[PDB]
Amino acid sequence: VSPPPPIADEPLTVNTGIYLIESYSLDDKAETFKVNAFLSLSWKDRRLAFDPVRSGVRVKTYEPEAIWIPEIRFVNVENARDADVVDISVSPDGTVQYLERFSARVLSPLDFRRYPFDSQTLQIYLIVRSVDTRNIVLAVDLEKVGKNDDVFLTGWDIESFTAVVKPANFALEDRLESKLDYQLRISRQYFSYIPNIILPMLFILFISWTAFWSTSYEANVTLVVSTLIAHIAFNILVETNLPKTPYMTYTGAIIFMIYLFYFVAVIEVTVQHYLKVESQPARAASITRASRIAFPVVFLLANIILAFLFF
Amino acid sequence: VSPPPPIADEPLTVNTGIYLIESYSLDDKAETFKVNAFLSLSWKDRRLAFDPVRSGVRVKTYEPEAIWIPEIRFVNVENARDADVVDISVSPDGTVQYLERFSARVLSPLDFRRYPFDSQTLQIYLIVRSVDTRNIVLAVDLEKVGKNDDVFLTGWDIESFTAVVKPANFALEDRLESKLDYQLRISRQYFSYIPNIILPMLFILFISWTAFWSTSYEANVTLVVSTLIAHIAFNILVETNLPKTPYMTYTGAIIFMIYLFYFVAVIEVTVQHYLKVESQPARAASITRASRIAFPVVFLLANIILAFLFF
Amino acid sequence: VSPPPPIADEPLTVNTGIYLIESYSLDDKAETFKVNAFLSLSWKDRRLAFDPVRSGVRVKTYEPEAIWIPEIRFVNVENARDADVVDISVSPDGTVQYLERFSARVLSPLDFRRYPFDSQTLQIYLIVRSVDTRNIVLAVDLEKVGKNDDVFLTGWDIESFTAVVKPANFALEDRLESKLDYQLRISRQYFSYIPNIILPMLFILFISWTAFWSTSYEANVTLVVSTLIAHIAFNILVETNLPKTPYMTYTGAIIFMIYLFYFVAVIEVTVQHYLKVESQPARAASITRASRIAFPVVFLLANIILAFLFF
Amino acid sequence: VSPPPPIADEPLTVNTGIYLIESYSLDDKAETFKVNAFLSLSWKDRRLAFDPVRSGVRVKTYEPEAIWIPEIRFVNVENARDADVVDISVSPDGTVQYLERFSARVLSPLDFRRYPFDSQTLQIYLIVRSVDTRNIVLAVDLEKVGKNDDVFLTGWDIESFTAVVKPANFALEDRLESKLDYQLRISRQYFSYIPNIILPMLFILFISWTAFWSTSYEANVTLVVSTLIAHIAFNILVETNLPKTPYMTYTGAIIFMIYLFYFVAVIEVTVQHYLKVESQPARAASITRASRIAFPVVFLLANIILAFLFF
Amino acid sequence: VSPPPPIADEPLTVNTGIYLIESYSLDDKAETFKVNAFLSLSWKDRRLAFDPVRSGVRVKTYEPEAIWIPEIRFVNVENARDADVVDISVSPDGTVQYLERFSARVLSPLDFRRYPFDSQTLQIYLIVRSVDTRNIVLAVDLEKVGKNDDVFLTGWDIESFTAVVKPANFALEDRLESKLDYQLRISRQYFSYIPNIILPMLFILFISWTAFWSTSYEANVTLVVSTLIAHIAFNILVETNLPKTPYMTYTGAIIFMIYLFYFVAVIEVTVQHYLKVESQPARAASITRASRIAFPVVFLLANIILAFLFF
Ligand SMILES: [Cl-]
Ligand SMILES: [Cl-]
Ligand SMILES: [Cl-]
Ligand SMILES: [Cl-]
Ligand SMILES: [Cl-]
Ligand SMILES: [Cl-]
Ligand SMILES: [Cl-]
Ligand code: NA
Ligand code: NA
Ligand code: NA
Ligand code: NA
Ligand code: NA
Ligand code: NA
């Protein structure tokens, strides 16, 4: 089969739509999600036109093999989509109405700067390559763009599914390509991070500060080093659920800054002991009393400044 | 092939029946499960009718290619089901009796609020898309719905496998769709959680309370901080077998609350030492004696209130 | 093609055989194993009979497409088996001799009660569905049942591969089904559990009992709490190699019981200190002396009783 | 079909070009990467020549089945590439212009010596096997060699995508082979290694050196042994993201050397205590004072020498 | 198609050759490796013979479909190999020269007794099943056995790739089978085990022996118990990279024996304290002084004896 011939010198407009059935597996480390959806295509093929009076039928159904169908592909996919044709219908004027159900693993990068309080715009790019006989341009039929009410992405809130209606038309290996941008806007459910990571991490830090109400070097060393090791365990746990970013994340900044607090608590604990041994308990006392106020105050201001830079 | 033509203006009724052969791999984190079952379909095609006297045969067998078969799909699947046709039989009146054996990865959300004492209703949605010539409606043939007595879901108790007999008929991309709800009711085997997570977690907590019968600051600091770290290990272990929920789970609530007990034990241990050093052992004694009763009592009431809110 | 017609009213007997070449991937968590074997089928089709004098040939080879072949399936498989036909041979009388080499992931439940000293009977169920024209019954040809001398299941001892020669004949969706039970009997190689889990676990427990020869509360608290944490690490390690059972396992019982020993060692360590502080070292001395004998004795009797209940 | 016949004694030149659409999943442990690209092939087949007046078209399209296409393979792939033909265009001279979109898992060794500050040259080898009738030679059409502006390897900086234009022509099993080298030059984003591994590791080491300002053997033993265990956790974490190299890596060398510092800190802590007990606090004092300067100085020079050997 | 008919009563000799292109993913726990090679087959079929004078051609190319090809299989594979035919060439006498490029996951057991200083012989078994008309025997064409110089197995040294030229001819289900043994000889790159596991493990052990230069029970208990827990972490790490063997490995032996050293250090530490408390510091002194020499000496002799038994 050959593509539909033009009346003048106009390109062929293939009207597209995506309707999400199942959205799943957002892998933060891999920066990938899986999709199960309807892909609907529509174009005019004058060669397929018929008279509904003479033919009796108001619509004709065709097997993909019988008629010309445009080679439509996804750009940002891992492998070629698993697709199964559902229906092909032709109207009297020759307007073809194609529908397939597909499944694909989409590769769209994420912005972890505000993590776990981040929002994302997942991208799905549709593309068509022009043939030598005719140039093919993509279009968005908004009535056939959308999603199921049951569509759920675990640990995420699905905000919207829309399309950037104007295609990106460009040359690639001396042939025209028509790209379309479908956008899935989602926002992370930060809830569980609070009782599982944030609050346990602050509790261990506050436990280290009880060393400011103790003269016992041996006990202090145990308090600050034990809690420091539990902080290393949280840092390791957190970095396992994220990829290696060339920038700092919100949780990353807080986790890093808390090391400085532990490091300075060790210097305080050391200085206090050294002085007690040097028979200077009075000077050691002043530094400990100051630390009781200084540590929570510097922690609160530091966190305010960090939240300000990130939000 | 074309669909069966109607006598009047009635829709085509495709009678369905899923019979579970194998139920396996319920991944709590992914909220998916895998199924292996028989799918049976039955409809009338007057075009296939024959006289049993003239043809001799009482039933005719057909290859899927030879006759019209409705395009039946699962809604909440990851990818299209792996299916293999077992038999196609036609009765004199033209009643077709289709049977296939399939396997699919079903995606159905889980409610972790009462975990590990939760029960679920796993959903399996069957669907058919109406053609322009005729509208197709699904039906449940209850004589052909069921499961093998050997069907076993590891770590779960299979309660029932039933179907919501009235289909959800609705429009989707200007065509009628007929959805059916098959339900697999299961309940978690909470047994192993008791000797592996719940009881070890309570033992370490009770070990921390032995600090209320000790005047040794150094030993107390070791007791409470060590057990706190083992509690962090259990929290990390528990959260690895579950997804990130925008709500609190039963085990989650208990695990979180226990941090508050450890935090308050550290303040008690600190206060007791401070007083002993300030030459106030009498006041420190009263607080320690009170803690011996207060801690187990507040723990028991808190747990009663939590069980009440969750069950 | 149609099935072979009967002489009288007798069912068609399909003679079966399985010869294992490769057995691998016994996942204890998934309760699955993978197999690569020969499936041999044999039946009489009188329509295929020939005279060896007239035809010259003593045997005729057919492509699967050319002749009728029974639809044979495995019951307890995850997905349909990957099969490749090796040979199809027809004798003068019409006896067909089919042979294929297949690979499948078998789902057969395991009994972890005596773990890691358990033995299993892995099940492989072969099934055939009767057609409307004729009823098909399965049979075991013992000369074609067996296993390769190289067959090795990692961490397991392969005892036998046999077949329960009498099929389970039953009705399923108003048609006859003939099921056959092939059994692979295996026994776990418990060896490595001794130097890697059992002996390290007993060593840490015996190290905790050295607290019965110490008056140092601070050292005792370190001994019992440190070793308790190493016991938690072994419990976590052990439960990762097993699924969640609704019953107690041998290792499970021992691991759990050992927590009680640690809990009671903490009470002893606490009581001893309390008394020393109360200026009652004599009473504390009696309890410590008793613990030295009591702890290993109660541990030995408890373990004898447990081994008795489980073996 | 047979290959194109020569005019004289010249080999057939198949012009190639790879245009990267997606580059993802660079696994350091496996030394693999995944690619999604355009493969374009072009050759002359005079047997396909046509007159456009006669044909009614200026460019002919063929299905792969219809015409002779050279068997082009990748060398360093795990399995055969997943390819889908996009277009085949024949011009009146007989110039075939083939285009396919493929995806493959490329196996290429990585040099971890300077890790995590390493740069790589990923290799992609194209090959063609000569037939008995004609010898096939590969060529690079530079106008068809490029990469999409969005191509992003997570945790890596993509520097260039080029081709070594001169093929490696050689004998293999008495037939000519024409190999082409496509190179992807990338450089690791070392950023995250600094706040997640390097700085936490140095902080714990500096915490161990606070033992040089303490006379408390019990506290010192806790300081040096605790931090040593946290260093073991970092070493285990680091070696999990890398394969086993028969050479030393930069991070590997630093991680190893730091063990020597911990080992010598333990000897210092031991010597200091032994002397204090032997009533020689003066000698112990000199060694401790020297250690305060010696340890950071020897650490700084050692690191300078290491950076010098590796960069 | 039928197999080539015999002149006498001689079997058909199929000449084989494997040429490795890619050898990768040796997974110790699964005892598997993945291979990507060339499989070349050659046999005489007198029916395909031609006169080069009359036919003009010196060689004829055939599609697999057109001529008889022997069903060649691998024995020790997980699934059937992914193969793609490269070329089929026929010489005047009727000598067929087949060539395919395949990929397979080979299952060959490994001997971990000397681990990580082990060497292996990975075995690849080629097999052919004789038909009723003729018996098929395999042969090795040494000129077509070999490997690419770039072939690299990560963490392993490839020594040789050879074939056991005499096939194992045997009966299996009353038909002859001709097995061939292709051997890939490899030796582990033990290098990284030295700075990552062996040396860190010895350092922690030597740190435990500093307890022999301390009278401080509290410090000793910390030294020996802390280092014991780090030894448990190395044992857990090591056993994760290996399968469960019914025999002892070299690393396994050393790791196990080191537990005995820790156990005896705890008894020494306990005895020393008990004596000091019983006002017997002189007796405690003798035992401690002896332990300083005894422990490293018994460790050195034990290790010599172990290396001797294993190498
Ligand atoms: Cl696609
Ligand atoms: Cl489906
Ligand atoms: Cl099957
Ligand atoms: Cl390829
Ligand atoms: Cl094979
Ligand atoms: Cl034999
Ligand atoms: Cl034979
Ligand atoms: Na088409
Ligand atoms: Na059909
Ligand atoms: Na301590
Ligand atoms: Na057949
Ligand atoms: Na071709
Ligand atoms: Na053939």
Numbering used by the authors:
A (entry chain C), B (entry chain D), C (entry chain E), D (entry chain B), E (entry chain A): 5 to 315
Give the exact sentences the study uses for this entry.
At present, the best structurally characterized pLGIC is the G. violaceus ligand-gated ion channel (GLIC), of prokaryotic origin. Each subunit consists of an extracellular domain (ECD), predominantly in a β-sandwich fold, and a transmembrane domain (TMD) composed of four helices, labeled M1–M4. However, the GLIC is a pH-gated channel, activated by lowering the pH, with a maximal activation at pH 4 and a pH50 around 5. We instead found that proton activation is a complex multiple loci mechanism, with the key contribution stemming from the coupling interface between the extracellular and transmembrane domain, with E35 acting as a key proton-sensing residue.
The basal principal (+) face, below Loop C, contains E82 and H127, along with a cluster of Asp/Glu residues found close to the TMD: D31, D32, and E35 from Loop 2, as well as D115 and D122 from Loop 7. Consistent with some of the previous studies of H127, H127N and Q both produce Wt-like currents. A structural analysis was performed on E26Q, E26A, E35Q, E35A, E67A, E75A, E82Q, E82A, D86A, D88N, D88A, H127N, E181A, and H277Q mutants, by solving their structure at pH 4. All structures were in the apparently open conformation. There are no significant differences, measured as 5-fold over Wt, seen in the backbone Cα residues of any of the resolved structures, with the exception of E35A and E82Q.
